[PDB]
Amino acid sequence: VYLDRKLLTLEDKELGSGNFGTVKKGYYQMKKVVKTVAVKILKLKDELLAEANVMQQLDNPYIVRMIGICEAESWMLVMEMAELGPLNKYLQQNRHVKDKNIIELVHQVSMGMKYLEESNFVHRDLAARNVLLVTQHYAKISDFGLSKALRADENYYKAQTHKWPVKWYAPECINYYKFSSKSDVWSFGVLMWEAFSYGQKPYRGMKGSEVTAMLEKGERMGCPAGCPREMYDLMNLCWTYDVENRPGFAAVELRLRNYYYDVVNHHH
Ligand SMILES: Cc1nnc(-c2nc(C)n3ccc(Nc4nccc(-c5cc(CN(C)C)n(C)n5)n4)cc23)o1
To answer: Domain of life here?
Structure first.
């Protein structure tokens, strides 16, 4: 859990920045090899510790692995490096990525979310900006800062007091402050829309309240250019208003798995 600061080398240039503080590239002296790492630096401590406590429990290829934690000048969260960075920024910069490759990447996210659902953990921040690329064909889910381990007796997490990424939030999140794997299914639909729109922001030019008003009228975002009908139908199904009728990640993953192999064998 706790790492040796003497074994950690941080780069001067920062990878990203936000509410948290900063993300910097580094190197950690492992068992015999040296491991390139992404380091979240705080510069709040309870939120970093809880985030590390969640990541310490997760074991899946489609989730970012935590190496450990370190207390130096600031509190640090050391993670395995996903070199190509956020999915949204990647697709904005690489607008010629094929449709089959986008299906492949969103399917990876669904396999990691299928795992999270089975482990009864709610992500609560599932967006294309929180998907990181190891390769152009290898996605991992990151950002477990809002993530919760569900109580043994509850299928949801109830938030006590409402910043919230409302454009990604299911109606029950807005209306009842209730966060479940099925609300993560809603966010995954928005994620699918972003990926097929090549990292474009959802509900362009709209306020949070205007989004709520639009969803309340039964209106949904349209089909992105070049997005197959089958993929847009899945997005719409993730956008089922009623939580009970909305599919779970095992059904979402199966839909995507089958479609991907249908496209794969069709290309041959
Ligand atoms: C903003 C922003 N945040 N990250 C970037 C960013 N930009 C480029 C070009 N990157 C390249 C590699 C990379 N690797 C990488 N690996 C493992 C973990 C992480 C990572 C990043 C975050 C922060 N979240 C807000 C995403 N956490 C919690 N974990 N990051 C990140 C990155 O931009």
So the answer is: Eukaryota
